Symmetry: C2
Subunit: 247 residues, 2 copies
């Protein structure tokens, strides 16, 4: 059903994304408030939706609700390593092996990979909209905006949080931009897909967008630090990026 090519990089993205979703539900047992439990639970709901449930039209939505319910009720005092044990036990129990990470080392790269994963899901949903509907895609895009608006870092970086709070709109803007092309199709002018950035839409737009945003954040971090970029620092190019993902 999904047309995303299988590549070593997409495999890494998917695994990082599952790790991210795991570190997120891990936060549930330690939630300081009902309001945060509600926010965390809806984020994990959407995350698992996009990675392991949507393939089967969310038929397993209740099993995820149960995984979330279990996570909220787990002990706040147990170690991340104990939670890992029980999490793996519970996901197997619930027939959600597909939602389990294989690698558990969490870095900034995990969070970036997670964002790049979503960008690919977004482009793929748009590409294959004729197999779902315009309405279904519009509804998934609303959820995507909520997801990007509410990114939890998990690791500690107050500078990262403030900065993302300031520029996350660049990402949401491009989701609205897709919604505009879909609505123009709804009203009678099919999307024409183009190579470059009355109804035109760049092919693989969202993959390009987040690649671009990822370079921008890394260029900006040298200004934050008030330093010349390291001698070996280099941006990802769109030519290489498309080849790595076979776009």
């Amino acid at each position: 059903s999904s047309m995303i090519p299988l590549t070593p990089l997409f495999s890494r993205y998917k695994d990082s994304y599952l790790l991210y979703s795991f570190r997120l539900i891990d936060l549930l047992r330690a939630s300081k408030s009902a309001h945060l439990t509600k926010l965390l639970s809806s984020q994990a709901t959407y995350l698992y939706h996009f990675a392991c449930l949507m393939k089967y039209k969310d038929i397993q939505k209740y099993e995820v609700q149960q995984l979330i319910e279990w996570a909220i009720n787990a002990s706040p005092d147990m170690d991340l390593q104990q939670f890992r044990i029980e999490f793996m036990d519970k996901t197997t129990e619930l027939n959600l092996r597909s939602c389990q990470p294989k690698s558990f080392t969490y870095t900034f790269t995990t969070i970036w990979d997670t964002m790049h994963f979503l960008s690919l899901i977004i482009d793929d949903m748009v590409y294959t909209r004729d197999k779902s509907s315009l309405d279904f895609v519009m509804q998934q895009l609303k959820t995507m905006k909520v997801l990007f608006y509410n990114v939890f870092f998990i690791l500690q970086c107050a500078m990262c949080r403030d900065h993302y709070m300031n520029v996350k709109g660049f990402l949401i803007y491009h989701i609205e931009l897709i919604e505009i092309a879909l609505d123009k199709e709804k009203y009678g002018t099919d999307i024409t897909f183009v190579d470059s950035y009355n109804n035109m839409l760049m092919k693989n737009l969202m993959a390009y967008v987040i690649m671009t945003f990822h370079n921008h954040v890394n260029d900006y971090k040298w200004i934050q630090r008030n330093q010349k970029p390291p001698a070996h620092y280099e941006r990802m190019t769109w030519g290489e990026y498309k080849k790595l993902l076979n776009l």
Copy 2:
């Protein structure tokens, strides 16, 4: 000192911007809190800075501090029309006729014109940086980001506020992008100015950016309303926009 061409449209922008700054200080007498008075006072400080003070290197900064102080102390019960009288009296008193609006009819267009004004100031500061310094421009850009982060609508539109909260980062992103080109110049690679959107920067980038953002918000409003765009609705094109402003 400023290289922005004089055109009827730029005149309208400047007047709208002064009206906006006036409607902002009008809010001071009615402020519900110290925290809001502080936020409102810093916004008006920056606004007048960019429109009527920076030409003379903020030599009149204290007169504006006095205008703000007066506005905070004015009666909360007097009518906008009374405040207009006294405001005009006080600005004349303080030799700030240059900061007075001529037209007082406040619309969404006033707010857009205000944003377009700032975009032109941003491009102009970058263009003429050799006459100030890289540091001075970097410092003005920080202030620009604060200004755009904290836009008050003044008129009532809860939909507008939520939406701008979600996508304002598109604008701030482009301010950081300018900061990246300036820092790359600092470290030894002059900016090359280009026509289209190792150190390249689009000429009139920020004018293009906010023009683009203004079209996006107007396209998006039909999706919010769940309607086909009106038969006579049309986007501004960059070709016409540059001619209107003689860019």
